Amino acid sequence: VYRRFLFVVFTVLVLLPLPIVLHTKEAECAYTLFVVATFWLTEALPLSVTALLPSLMLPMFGIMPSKKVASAYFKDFHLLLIGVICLATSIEKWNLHKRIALKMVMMVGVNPAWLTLGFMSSTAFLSMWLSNTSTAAMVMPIAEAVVQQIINAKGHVTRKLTCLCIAYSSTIGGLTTITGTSTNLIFAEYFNTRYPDCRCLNFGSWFTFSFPAALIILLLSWIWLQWLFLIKQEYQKLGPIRYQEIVTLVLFIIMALLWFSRGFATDSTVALLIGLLFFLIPAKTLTAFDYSPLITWKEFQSFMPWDIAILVGGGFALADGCEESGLSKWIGNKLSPLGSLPAWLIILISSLMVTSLTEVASNPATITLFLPILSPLAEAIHVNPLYILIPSTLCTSFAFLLPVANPPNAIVFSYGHLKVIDMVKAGLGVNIVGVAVVMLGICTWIVPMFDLYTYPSWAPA
Amino acid sequence: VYRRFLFVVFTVLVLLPLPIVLHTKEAECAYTLFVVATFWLTEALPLSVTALLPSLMLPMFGIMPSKKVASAYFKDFHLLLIGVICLATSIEKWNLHKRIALKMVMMVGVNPAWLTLGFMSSTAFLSMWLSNTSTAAMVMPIAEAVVQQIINAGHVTRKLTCLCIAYSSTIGGLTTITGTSTNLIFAEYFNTRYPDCRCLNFGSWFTFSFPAALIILLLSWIWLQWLFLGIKQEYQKLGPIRYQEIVTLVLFIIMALLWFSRPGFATDSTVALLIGLLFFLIPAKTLTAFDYSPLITWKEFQSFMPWDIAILVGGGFALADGCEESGLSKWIGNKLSPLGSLPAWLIILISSLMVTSLTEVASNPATITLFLPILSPLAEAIHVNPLYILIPSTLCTSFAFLLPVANPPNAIVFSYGHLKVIDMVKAGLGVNIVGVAVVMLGICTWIVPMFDLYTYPSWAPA
Ligand SMILES: CC(C)CCC[C@@H](C)[C@H]1CC[C@H]2[C@@H]3CC=C4C[C@@H](O)CC[C@]4(C)[C@H]3CC[C@]12C
Ligand SMILES: CC(C)CCC[C@@H](C)[C@H]1CC[C@H]2[C@@H]3CC=C4C[C@@H](O)CC[C@]4(C)[C@H]3CC[C@]12C
Ligand code: NA
Ligand code: NA
């Protein structure tokens, strides 16, 4: 009774017994550690309120920030993210993302079973640019209407096979771009901090090592999903193609051709030069007296992730706060026999610990907690840091079990079908295929790309 | 004909004849100067798109950023602004700001002419916390309904009440560093460039400017009432006082009592985050039940927070440092060497009158962004305290009281029926001269013993 308020009686709870430790300087900093890590996993607070808590609690105990090295008022990853969001804002303001999801399904829709590959290929291409949650929330109304008019010409299992294709291929196409999922932005913001001399990570080199990785997972999970389970009038009611979709489509082909083919030759120059045209090209008249452009600043501010910059800096103030106190030395002495395992065994034992924790917690929470653990470990045992951080930001996205992990597969669970055991039987095939393909990747073709066997010059010592 | 598109045929225009200069390294950097300054004043682009233009154009010519000194992932002014916005988010989500605007008018509403002072005192107190544009857009529906039921018991009392809402929303917009938006561009420019100064917080901006605005508020009521003329049922239809307004009002008195009365946790940004982050936690609604919702959500907080101020400041720094890497700051620095022979007080009068005149035709964040990296190099060169010049120029930026294109407070009240354009010029020139004279009286007598304005400090370089 009265456990409809289980957020407030838990946040107020956790701060009460945890002040057993009030005794020294490392016990007070470990109090901030087990509180912010607790509210990130259970998500009792909205994940950026919690990132402001080390900026409040640590000066109260007497642990002040002391880092004083930065540069560059506008960073290069911040200007790439500006130009990508303003392309992804007008592509769904003007409903261009339903033309493509219908035209791709129509082309390869011979449908013995090529409808399923038609649905996966249409929502994995849309996840490279849009967010995973917003692109699964519009193919799912489309696919439910198509599969109802097909059965209006056995029928139960083809409704929950089509459900899992939308939820799983929105995540597989969520990688292959550093701006596809949100957890590819926390990796890229942690890496341009802490390692600001590294120039090996841009838009056109994340796509080259991960598009061969996801095409194998996409083609092998279609075969797995189709195994264990078994429209011209829908495109006609979108209307004719408008003016504001031809302009958006032309700037989308122009921008993506220069990213892969190309001090002004950086990828953040193409993002701002073609991205800032969306604030300029006229779209509507509003009688006339004054036009309106393709996107406005109030719509751009709605789509931009501002909470990622608070989440990264809140993870840095917690990590540096453990270094000023004696906590990083104290647990560093009890874990000295960890540096006797081989380099490949650290990869397998960590990527299986991240692909298992991401099923019960959100993906930006488990990439924020684990990324300042593996990167000190990689410099200590004299490994290239990208050799450990690349297969852990890729196995974070592999959240394919029970529908509390990522909000893609909680949308498709909100429909009628697809009880919980249908995800565990289907997700364990895509999970094992996903881990084995990335483990195959960092042994053969990723190593000659980023020079993963040679300790670089951006790592300290 | 076809000049309904005068934005796109002007932005595309200005970039065409201005590449006469393509010849050297300072001529290419002055090309970026006269483009970004042109789109800030005319506002052909939304004022943060333009701040990203020196981050695009300057690496193309070969002028790279080279500054490498900062600290402190979260700054102290950023944590004060977080806690203020989440108090100003729930105060208008739950309509607490109409209780106060009606209860203050009701109390001093004897109305021979105390209705006018009742309206100014209710919308100047609400501008210390809310934004100037959003607090003039809700007293103006209220005052038009009250002045219509008073005349139903007459033309010049409709446009006297209009100008009280537009002018006292700006006078109460100062006295807080988070009241207007141009008090945030001053405070963000000053914690950059001068990071050793600890003299500027919430509780010392209010002490030097609340005596400055109370004199301008009390003297412009006398001026406005002169040149123009010599409600329990409106409060009853708000309903009874709810649950979510008593909780917001209690945390508003708690937070403001500790700001003025108070190892390293005794700062003003601690009170802002400790009482501000309770608005994400206290339950407000049930939504059947199975899961409550708090007083404010993160999607509503993200809507009210000014994110474009941090882009506008860093875009002004990349343009200012870009002129220093090239030879432009030395080239115009040699042609302006006889400027450093005027007295210290004459620089104040000649600059505050140049900023209070330009802010009538351009927006206030555009004229504080262009002028703040001009006066602060000038104050270090002629050996003056930099706060002695920057304080009376961030205060005369807000004095936009003439024709209704200056600030969006007095374009809202112009959008109603009354108040033709000459009624603002006759009324605004009285509030303008009173405003400049009170700040000039302030920086001579009581502001100087507060910030030590005659002694060159230790945070300025040399
Ligand atoms: C973000 C928060 C958790 C930082 C605190 C993380 C602790 C767990 C991290 C910080 C420092 C890390 C240690 C850095 C140093 C060493 C010594 C090396 O031979 C083994 C790795 C080991 C032992 C790392 C283990 C993990 C570690 C101790
Ligand atoms: C933001 C942009 C405009 C920066 C370029 C501004 C130019 C106008 C600013 C930058 C440097 C400034 C100069 C700094 C040095 C001097 C020499 C001193 O005896 C007179 C002031 C004077 C001459 C300043 C005048 C204004 C100035 C030249
Ligand atoms: Na995505
Ligand atoms: Na205000």
Residue numbers in the entry:
A (entry chain B): 9 to 161, 232 to 308, 333 to 364, 381 to 405, 415 to 588
B (entry chain A): 9 to 161, 233 to 309, 333 to 364, 380 to 405, 415 to 588
What does the paper say about this structure?
For human NaS1, we captured both inward-facing conformations, namely, apo (NaS1_apo_IN/IN) and sulfate-bound states (NaS1_sulfate_IN/IN), achieving resolutions of 2.9 and 3.1 Å, respectively. The sulfate is coordinated by core domain of NaS1, which remains unchanged in different conformational states. In the structure of NaS1_IN/IN (top), sulfate stabilization relies on the side chains of Ser139 and Thr141 from HPin, as well as Thr259 and Ser260 of L5. Key residues participating in sulfate and sodium binding are from L5 and HPin of NaS1. A single sodium ion (named Na1) is distinctly coordinated within the NaS1 structure, involving the carbonyl oxygen atoms of Ser135 and Leu138, along with the side chain of Asn140 from HPin, and the carbonyl oxygen atoms of Gly258 on L5. The sodium density proposed to be bound around L10 and HPout is not found in cryo-EM map density. A notable variation is observed in Ser260 of NaS1, which is corresponding to the Pro201 in VcINDY, Gly288 in NaCT, and Ala241 in NaDC1 of L5, where Ser260 in NaS1 could potentially preclude citrate and succinate binding. (A) Cholesterol binding stabilizes the inward-open conformation of NaS1. During the transport cycle, the binding of cholesterol within NaS1-IN/IN induces the displacement of HPout in both horizontal and vertical directions with respect to the membrane plane.
The solute carrier 13 (SLC13) family comprises electrogenic sodium ion–coupled anion cotransporters, segregating into sodium ion–sulfate cotransporters (NaSs) and sodium ion–di- and–tricarboxylate cotransporters (NaDCs). NaS1 and NaDC1 regulate sulfate homeostasis and oxidative metabolism, respectively. From an overall view, both the NaDC1 and NaS1 form a homodimer, and each protomer consists of 11 TMDs. The rest TMDs form the core domain that is responsible for substrate recognition and conformational change to complete the transport cycle.
